[PDB]
Design a protein around this ligand. Structure first.
Ligand SMILES: NC(=O)c1cc[n+](COC[n+]2ccc(/C=N/O)cc2/C=N/O)cc1
Ligand SMILES: NC(=O)c1cc[n+](COC[n+]2ccc(/C=N/O)cc2/C=N/O)cc1
Lengths: 533, 535
């Protein structure tokens, strides 16, 4: 019984495991329950605080992954499987992981809370890419990551109902955030320096925590990697949630109470089986059960909330990868594949766009097509493929990010923006996907520091830079290294200057305007188009 | 006859002409100026198609320019050269259907390719007698037979009650056509080769050239066309029959006037009254919109220029088209608040949004917002210099660059041999401010080789450049190809193609080949904007 690996949290005692990171040990407390297993009648329900336990809870092992669709598009492909649950699926999955330095830090340490992505339909805090050991070891970070319920389990909302209020996956996260507040000190986490970070749906979750009052007291800073609460995919209206919940109910043979009661009776996988059949359109980058504008967790739409919010005492790191959109093309856009070069035809581009912008009228879609077509090379398939990617990325991540960045900056938030452009040497996706959604995580998390992983030493150094930025950001709300000078400085993203840095192997390069023209199209014109059909 | 210069006496179908031996820098040219090609479209012939000039007796003196067609005289900057050079430089009269011929002197031995200039002036102004249209240089240096005609502008040329007999529309185009007919029959008398007739015109003249390309009966009258900064397609070069009707009847009301009764009344109105009200009939506050312009009558223009360029076969056709660096700047000073020649015209976002409404007067709120969204530099959305230049770009793009783009594209896609340029050289002599860059119409003096007149204060590179441009134009006139056939030492001007979209820069530097005529931005105007108006 290593006394460093033994912690009394509020619910009782935990025994962590001493994990080794390349530069020394780290105390990992994995699988800490932060809620009553949201099983049985607790399905679709807000998480209840975990009841205290007797003895020493073994917290040396990752707990189950929240029940979710396992991707099957390319079975056994590292590029997909690395996101697949790497633990048993269970609805009993409300667990969080805490990595701290070994020994437990002397003074309260900034806490980073990771919220995984997975389109609100998947993910697990246990995936290798979210291994917090590196940030814990190299940076002395207390790194927390929770599981939260995904898909129907996390986000089936019958808005207004008691039994499926929606947003429970976010409430899960909130609970983990509460758990951190009440408990992290026991690990030498500073509950007064908690930085959320997350990517993609995790970023959106972070943004939703930013935009939800009861969440705001549970952290001080946020990082949104490649995802925003605003935007086309991260939220649905109450009505749309109801529609999909209802549709799923039909699809599985099921007032809200009786509908939900029936849904409660359904084997987890049945819900998952029919989860995708509730999308109004053939889509990419769209997900059936996502946070719901419920008037409750989200008092208004994220757009509304980022327009009106006061974000004075908020610091935010946001950014995108170079190819936000490439990843998604292979999952429903004809002509795209990890296997060929996905050189697509004009027609496949126009059709691809209807799938990428499923909410688009013909005119909006034409607007998009006409905007993204390089008219010097209108039918060149490389351009069209890259444009399809661009469309999907801009529409879904880049422009939502720019919007968020701008709105937060305009409304007092200190904002740092980045574009991550380094394509992992070890990346199993084809070159044309460039730097896909999610492939910065391994770097932020510091996996290149694990020599056994085959990352180049330029990458190891890069990961170190990024872990420095992230944790400096966590420590201080400023990602710049004070123990460094002018190599060069990461400026706050402002609405005037619109500065952001490229994160890649070269030093920070400050760029201005995060696809400013194109985002103007998406953020300013596109809504005007559709808001007049 | 007998005591005078034997090389200035020419007979044409209507009779005997005495021209004038004019001094060009490199030697003399023959000019036959103010040759009537139509019956004065006066009195009862106002608004009527031109009738062929009835033969005259004796030797018609063709030694001076004739009347300029009755027109509005721009008075925004009185005494300012930049506006005065466009201003009529001969008496304003409805009796104005006269053309001009410059030929080498002595007249060319063998049939020489004919250049016919059609001046612009927004269809409400212009005159073949402006100094910038002086054919002497192209005649002297290039051996070209240059012909320019006056055609009726404004109401007299374009007021239309479509369907009516008495104001069928497009008569100013018909004057041009009549002058083309004149060149066909008579140009050989000057050593002109009626089988090598190139039209060229700038701005409304270019639209006019385009109209002729688009109009069957004109087709047999020329072989090649140059469209400088103007196109028959685009938002200003034509009006629907309905809109022409609307403006004609409104103009009528404005001056106190069944089509016959209306026209008859209009015919009793003094020219100046018509001119005085000409500009009050535009549907919106606007720039680069002109009240009386060619009408889609289903006669001269069998359908919209858009429709005819989209579906015509342009096999036999060589077209040189192009734009100036800054097509839009000129028009900004005449009715976009904020803009002036007298200052840097740094405007505000408000003034830009306002400008866009004036610059794209046909635009719905949504379409205007698109324009604004497109042209705003979102890094510097409030930046007055960018906004000022974006305003210019909006007007230039919308009215010239993108119409030219659609035109070049559609023409190339349909068999035409298209050569495309952007003229980027700002005359060292330009009296407009620097921000205006190279405004609309300021390539003309170079095409015409004015810089060759040593007394005109152009620089030597400008003289050389004029010569190059004159070469391009006359080569294109000769061969359908602006390139010098021997001289491959100079870079080649490739045809504009839909595939490669090549055009050249015309500036002091040797031909640089560029790709895509604002391809991205013209996709907005030519492909997106129409759709944004179909709802
Ligand atoms: N719940 C379901 O049955 C289900 C869920 C998700 N998909 C598609 O998910 C594939 N996938 C997997 C991973 C990513 C994100 N990568 O960064 C994106 C995507 C899709 N984008 O449209 C199909 C069925
Ligand atoms: N009734 C008309 O069509 C009309 C009459 C007079 N103007 C005076 O316009 C000023 N102006 C005068 C000269 C030029 C071009 N000169 O080369 C361009 C412009 C701009 N027009 O919007 C315009 C339309």
């Amino acid at each position: 019984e290593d006394p460093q690996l033994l912690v009394r949290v509020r619910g009782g005692q935990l025994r962590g495991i001493r994990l080794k990171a390349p530069g020394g040990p780290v105390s990992a407390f994995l699988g800490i329950p932060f809620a009553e297993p949201p099983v049985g009648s607790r399905r679709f329900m807000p998480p209840e605080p975990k009841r205290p336990w007797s003895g020493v809870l073994d917290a040396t092992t990752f707990q189950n992954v929240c029940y979710q669709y396992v991707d099957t598009l390319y079975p056994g492909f590292e590029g997909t499987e690395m996101w697949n649950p790497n633990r048993e699926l269970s609805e009993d999955c409300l667990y969080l992981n805490v990595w701290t330095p070994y020994p437990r830090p002397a003074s309260p340490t900034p806490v980073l809370i990771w919220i995984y992505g997975g389109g609100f339909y998947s993910g697990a805090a246990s995936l290798d890419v979210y291994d917090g050991r590196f940030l814990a070891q190299v940076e002395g970070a207390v790194l927390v990551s929770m599981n939260y319920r995904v898909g129907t389990f996390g986000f089936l909302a019958l808005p207004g109902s008691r039994e499926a209020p929606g947003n429970v996956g976010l409430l899960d996260q909130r609970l983990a955030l509460q758990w951190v507040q009440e408990n992290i000190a026991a690990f030498g986490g500073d509950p007064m320096s908690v930085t959320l970070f997350g990517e993609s749906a995790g970023a959106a979750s972070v943004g939703m925590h930013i935009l939800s009052l009861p969440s705001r007291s549970l952290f001080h800073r946020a990082v949104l990697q490649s995802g925003t609460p605003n935007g086309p995919w991260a939220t649905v209206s109450a009505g749309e949630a109801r529609r999909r919940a209802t549709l799923l109910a039909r699809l599985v043979g099921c007032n809200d109470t009786e509908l939900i009661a029936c849904l409660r009776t359904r084997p987890a996988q049945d819900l998952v089986d029919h989860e995708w059949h509730v999308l109004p359109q053939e889509s990419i980058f769209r997900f059936s059960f996502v946070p719901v504008v419920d008037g409750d967790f989200l008092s208004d739409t994220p757009e509304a909330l980022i327009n009106t919010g006061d974000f004075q005492d908020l610091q935010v790191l946001v950014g995108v990868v170079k190819d936000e959109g490439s990843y998604f093309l292979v999952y429903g856009v004809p002509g795209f594949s990890k296997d060929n070069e996905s050189l697509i035809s004009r027609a496949q581009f126009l059709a691809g766009v209807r799938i990428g912008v499923p909410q688009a009228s013909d005119l909006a879609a034409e607007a998009v097509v006409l905007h993204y077509t390089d008219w010097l090379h209108p039918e060149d398939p490389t351009h069209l493929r890259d444009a399809m990617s661009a469309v999907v990325g801009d529409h879904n991540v880049v422009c939502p990010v720019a919007q968020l960045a701008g709105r937060l900056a305009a409304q007092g938030a200190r904002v740092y923006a980045y574009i991550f452009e380094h394509r992992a040497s070890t990346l199993t996706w084809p070159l044309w996907m460039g730097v896909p959604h999610g492939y910065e995580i391994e770097f932020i998390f510091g996996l290149p520091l694990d020599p056994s992983l085959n990352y180049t030493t330029e990458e190891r150094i890069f990961a170190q830079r990024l872990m420095k930025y992230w944790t400096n950001f966590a420590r201080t709300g400023d990602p710049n290294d004070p123990r460094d000078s002018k190599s060069p400085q990461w400026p706050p993203y402002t609405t005037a200057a619109q500065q952001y840095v490229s994160l890649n192997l070269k030093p920070l390069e400050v760029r201005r305007g995060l696809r400013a023209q194109t985002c103007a199209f998406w953020n300013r014109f596109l809504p005007k188009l559709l808001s007049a059909t």
